[PDB]
Design a protein around this ligand. Structure first.
Ligand SMILES: [Cl-]
Ligand SMILES: [Cl-]
Ligand SMILES: [Cl-]
Ligand SMILES: [Cl-]
Ligand SMILES: [Cl-]
Ligand SMILES: [Cl-]
Ligand SMILES: [Cl-]
Ligand SMILES: [Cl-]
Ligand SMILES: [Cl-]
Ligand SMILES: [Cl-]
Ligand SMILES: [Cl-]
Ligand SMILES: [Cl-]
Ligand SMILES: [Cl-]
Ligand SMILES: [Cl-]
Ligand SMILES: [Mg+2]
Ligand SMILES: [Mg+2]
Ligand SMILES: [Mg+2]
Ligand SMILES: [Mg+2]
Ligand SMILES: [Mg+2]
Ligand code: NA
Lengths: 397, 411, 411, 397, 408
């Protein structure tokens, strides 16, 4: 019986992103750390943890993670969504951290142990020129990456070479046909230069309307991308059937999900090959395990969302999940910077294309509380989310 | 092109630039209520409901820290752009906290547009498609006789529809066989609830026959096999609707019910993601949609959802609980007299403190709620009154709903 | 209840009683155009489009003899009730004659409401969700070079989308192997049409590459096996859309296409019954809905259909042919800047006679149509100008479309 | 080769209804008569015939009914709907009348002859009291009817015993629950008094919302009605699946149809037992034959709509169709009055529960042109179509 | 009741009582043909086609021993009732022998009705919806140059559609040691010859004419699917009988991934064979042999059923059919709006003698007869110079290299 004695939520911005950590203290003296990172609205997550989860949780038994999760999820009656789920996730991860520490085992060992030696990793190559891409690709290949997500061009900002209306509404503009043309050209160039040296990934980032997605799938399937990610927004995934009926292209989707109705039909109908959920968005380790299991039955594999806007605690959690879950496929990775490494010591980095799970007791990564205070929250507008098409229409960003 | 430039100039002339956004939490009676206020350079002020009573400070953080700096300086006229833009602004989206904050703004923008048009809100929409909306109220008691007393009172007031509940479900497990040291929570027994409710319907029909329409809210208390059995048990009593017979995540089990029972079904007060309702409606799994307008992001998506339902022949009974501002209720009445497929409006009487903070809140008359006829929504918040009643923490222990073995059930 | 009585009194005060209904047919240029005019006691006049060019006198009989005595004395404010009531008023319903007559009234009532609100029509709806709508125009010629000439002209004007057609299809069967004494009609050969069109796409892409979006209207010329083959033949050329690849009665054959071709599809200009579009959209058989707004009964059902399409991710390209008043076109532009899922507006230049009868008709500027910014729809009919151009009988011989063996095909 | 020399459209109102007849003259001297009756909008039908069908048709070969039908149907480009279809129907029926006359055969013999001796008939018993119903039922039983459509109560007019809003909008009001209660009570009374002496039919006339229709189906299925008609409006027939899945009630629908999309899914999915199309509403004899054939394949039977608002020419056409089409089931009938019999001589009336097809050349019933002029068109508002529910909402009438 | 009896008198005065039923098998040329003749008290005689060439004595037995005593005395006017009655008369129903026998009577009854009406058959139906029906003919050879020679001839005659078959030139196939007797073929060789045939024709003639090809149920489903993808680029007007009637659900696998135009149904004699096929749009043309489904009466209904689903009609018109049957199909083809094309093979002189006035295509079109009735009858004295003769039809014992029977 391990009574929860305190709950804290710290927002820290060591580098580019507002990061959110939840800290759970227990009377047994064991402390857990969890990721609650919803970078766009961090003060709302912190309010949720401080004003609501904390008085709910203090005095309750930390051992019973499953009950505390089921209870937390329905506690406000209305449920699901990014603010509640991230707050819960931070607590849930911290609770698993504590249980693993008390067991004196690495997190993935609690789960049932390894089903692979380490998880393969992909990184990001992004440039406004092919030469910029080549330079980044060559570097990553030298470091031993076998999977690289490639993007030609940047899409947003002022509408310079775009035929807008005469007085366009303020926003971040792009042209879907330009994006398609550039991306197809990128794939053609890369295959001509590198052949089958590495797996090419690409993130469509819900930029397209359904008919454009179906066309794009047909234009790039010959290049056998390891996956094409978020080819459609979450509200339109039924359109995937048109693609699956006539194209061999490998698809990944789901980083935006925070309600189970978003993924069930998707997986039951085998509309994607990889699920890309952001663990903290779906409510933490507890539901991530069940989702991995649900996918496994249908033969869908796992590529959890691992963006720079996530703590290294969250990344370590994902690696524990990835070496355990038999249907885990690959882990997204972006290099950490000095400030972030200082606030979150011992964060693992890929080695020759692989990320290895921590082997000490717990998640294996905590937050240095003193170092975090050197980097308070800082407001950012995130102007790219005001994504507009040439006619001035908002499109899903 | 000069002509095009002139047309834009003319657009700028009729602009209503947002000058301020505020979020007030107020608790005049039992519930923490949330109002968003939007001011414009033209001096026209809008009021909207952002009420998520269980997490009000999170909604207020959302409005104050994020929606405000996003919206100041923008043209209030273009509600549709502002809604589409607000909905995706955090990238991750949907959910009760963001949707309520957005609803508060959306409703206030519609209020502003209607005031500038000098019309009641429903007239902006396209006008009335009914004279007024029928209303149901709530009768709840731990005895059948206590229920009859409340029923008799409402029938005398002219209500023709009453949501009836026999028994109270929650609290300490007094007459429930739990494990030896039950986990702290609000306990109930599903079988006792089913038994009490079936008996309630039987007794009401014996006593009142066809005098009034009987509604009942299952409130996601049941597992699917219990739901299917219950539908067969009470279908003979022809409820006007049986509400939330299953939680949002299990609505595919409604097919089993629709295939074998004639029972009339309502669902959806918990929805805050469109994936929750699309399959539900497309497959005609319910007869009434019950969404909470602020939970789905305001008037803008409510109109669309109304129209979507209408094509499938599904009707509308928006959620109108005590935990909603009278502003939200007035908005619902405007939507209800306008949308042709609206069916009925839930109502609970306002207490004096609430009436003080929100003057002119409409009450049903002979079983009908009438839409406001002055410009705008027609109901505002008294800001000075509101501040006498600041937010106050409530745990809402009923949401820790436990079954006899100590497990959580959807509350 | 006195308070309720006062509220009704207040409703009566803001009433706009219909005082007159008129229907004018006018033919300033090539087409018989139809405008409905609605007057109110308040002195506010509305204008709407009721254009069914092939049967204008039937539409006028419908307005003058039936809708007029039905509507005089009724409150114009309640567009939604008036629409629901008009739609069922003859018992039998739907169809091009009744829908157009109703559309004329519905659009004029919306015009009146917007004028009384002192807002542009799109602002009544909820405001803009785009700055302006993109526009495509028509290029048609019997030679590839003649097509390039028209294309070059439109590209210079800033169009980014052009509907292209190579060859003309109809008239006497000059180079067609018919039976010995072919029945009188407008003859064409499906295979020659397919061959010409495929070559047209190939040549345009070779000449212009990705410079502009290519549209093409199949105009229900084909049998389903021809449609499926054609989709596979031109999908590589990525048309912006292929329009009416099948007649309305054969759209289930679109599944065969959707399952094997990436081709972008548009359909629906012929619809005047909701059963024609529901399955189409629910099953995502097209990418753009193409309904003719007056054919489906006006702005009121157009808004609903827009919203319905939006939930399924289907976008909107309302039919905007020469046989429609500039009033109808302005209405379409208002719907297009408002509805978030609107995609593009078809446009053909107005001739001087037409401009005289309908002053202030908007023209595209650099490939965009901008919504009017004055109160109302923004475009009216000049009644004195209109009468210089009375109805004139036209047979429309192209609708007697025959295949080489002499059989009728959907025209 | 039989050239069309003239086309005329006469509206006549010998009794209660504006009736519409189309007359086609041919150079061979043979004259055809057809029904185009859309009683609510007769001047629009007449305009359509006079101003559009006539100049299209004069000079064309009357023999080729199939081509003339296909051609007429698409002639305005936009198509289907009650005004165009009724005008076409009048011409189509008149063309078949001419062909039968030239063949010197009764219409049904042209078709392929009889597949039954005569068609069974039902009539209408309607009263605001049960005693009124009993009196009408007893009469019809005595005349040898074995099928009677029964209705208790009248639904419309001023809202006397209805709880409306305080100032209800002008219209024709009814209460759906009152209607259901009365109708169930009617069935119970009739079965108690008459047992299985006759088949009971009832017309719901689209008065109900879907959940009310499903309930009503369950409340009356025990009474084994011969059919329940129009239990739902045409836009909601997909709801019939809920009924068909759980109720044995026999259903009829379709009098409102004037677009084939309205009936195809209905019949393919066996959602009704009888189709009730109004022949002139679907465009005449030509499409009625095809529809009968289409239904036959699916096992759906035919009860063509035969209301008082139809010429006796139209009724005779329906009897010719009914003795020919093997899946025809029953013919609705209402007695003709003196004025109507004068304008349309020799109209057949049921005999001992049966209607017999005409046996002279042609349809067998024509219009007396002189007698029709004594009864010009007269405007009627048809106020019942402004049908409102207690809250003042329009409902499908 | 008086008025009803008076109606019953007028009907009686117009009744046309069947007085005799006859069935003649005749073999003027290559095929045993079957004609039913119905006589009436009117003195009006009708002729119909009952041709099931492989089993003609069974059909004749069916007519002479069973339909004849059933029909004598009954009113010929009521074709619909007599059809419904005949179809269920042996309780067990459907099938090629019963349906052909019934078809002969049915067509003959329509012939009589049209003669009494003094109208061409198609005019009874409601008249023309086209001027004439386009025609395809048969080009068959064991060499490409033989094919070219026939194609060139037909093109000069004005045909725009040609069914092309390139056959083999079990002596060259790898069978087992002592192959069971039968008519052997190799599916892979057939597929290869056919693909190369299409390729050559398009190379040589481009889009000069529409190419049709009859697979004649020779393939397994995986081979049918492959073949569809192999020839779809050549845009055949239709590929006929790509699968046997029992395996048509496999057509979905084709429809989901190929644009190939398909026709099927000449083998059908039971409605259950075509309903799902049409409801699910699994073919583009229905190919039913009219006498196999039981005559004009059900052909009219089937055409209407097809029309609703957008399926078009190409009735089976082989050489093993009377010219009476062919004329009936042309009447059906000029009337039904969804009729597409009529198969035709040239009549030889003996057949012309037995069936005078049989129409031939003119410039790629067949014109419906314009006299009263079907327009073609059998000359009974000439028919008896050509009595039935037994033929084994050894091609129906169709075997694969391993000795297995395959659908022929
Ligand atoms: Cl930023
Ligand atoms: Cl755009
Ligand atoms: Cl109080
Ligand atoms: Cl509480
Ligand atoms: Cl509580
Ligand atoms: Cl339990
Ligand atoms: Cl000009
Ligand atoms: Cl013309
Ligand atoms: Cl023309
Ligand atoms: Cl043709
Ligand atoms: Cl009346
Ligand atoms: Cl009501
Ligand atoms: Cl010869
Ligand atoms: Cl042989
Ligand atoms: Mg991504
Ligand atoms: Mg509830
Ligand atoms: Mg078009
Ligand atoms: Mg009826
Ligand atoms: Mg064959
Ligand atoms: Na496919």
């Amino acid at each position: 019986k391990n009574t929860i004695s305190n709950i804290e939520c710290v927002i820290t911005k060591p580098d580019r992103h507002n990061l959110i950590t939840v800290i759970v203290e227990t009377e047994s003296g064991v402390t857990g750390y969890g990721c609650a990172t919803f970078q766009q609205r961090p003060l709302a997550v912190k309010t949720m943890v401080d004003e609501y989860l904390k008085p709910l949780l203090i005095g309750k038994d930390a051992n019973n993670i499953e009950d505390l999760w089921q209870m937390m999820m329905v506690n406000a009656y209305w449920r699901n969504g990014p603010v509640i789920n991230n707050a819960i996730s931070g607590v849930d991860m911290a609770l698993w951290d504590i249980k693993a520490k008390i067991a004196n085992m690495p997190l993935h060992q609690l789960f049932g142990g390894k089903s692979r030696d380490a998880i393969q990793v992909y990184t990001h190559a992004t440039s406004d020129t092919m030469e910029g891409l080549y330079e980044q690709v060559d570097k990553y290949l030298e470091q031993g990456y076998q999977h690289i997500r490639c993007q030609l061009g940047f899409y947003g900002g002022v509408p310079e070479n775009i035929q807008t209306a005469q007085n366009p509404t303020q926003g971040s503009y792009y042209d879907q046909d330009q994006y398609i043309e550039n991306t197809v050209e990128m794939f053609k160039n890369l295959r001509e230069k590198y052949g089958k040296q590495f797996h090419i990934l690409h993130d469509v980032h819900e930029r397209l309307f359904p008919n454009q997605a179906i066309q794009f799938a047909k234009q790039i399937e010959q290049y056998n991308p390891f996956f094409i990610e978020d080819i459609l927004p979450p509200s339109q995934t039924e359109w995937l059937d048109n693609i699956r009926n006539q194209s061999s292209v490998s698809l990944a989707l789901g980083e935006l999900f925070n309600n189970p109705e978003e993924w069930k039909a998707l997986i039951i109908n085998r509309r994607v090959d990889f699920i890309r959920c952001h663990v903290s968005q779906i409510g933490g380790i507890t539901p991530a395990l069940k989702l991995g299991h649900f996918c496994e039955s249908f033969g869908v594999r796992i590529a959890w969302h691992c963006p720079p806007d996530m703590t290294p605690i969250g990344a370590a959690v994902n690696t524990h999940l990835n070496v355990h879950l038999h249907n885990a496929a690959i882990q997204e990775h972006v290099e950490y910077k000095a400030n972030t490494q200082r606030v979150f010591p011992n964060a693992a980095e890929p080695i020759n294309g692989y990320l290895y799970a921590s082997e000490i007791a717990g998640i294996g990564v905590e937050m240095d509380r003193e170092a975090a205070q050197d980097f308070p929250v800082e407001y950012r507008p995130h102007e790219w989310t005001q994504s507009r098409l040439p006619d001035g229409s908002i499109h899903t960003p």
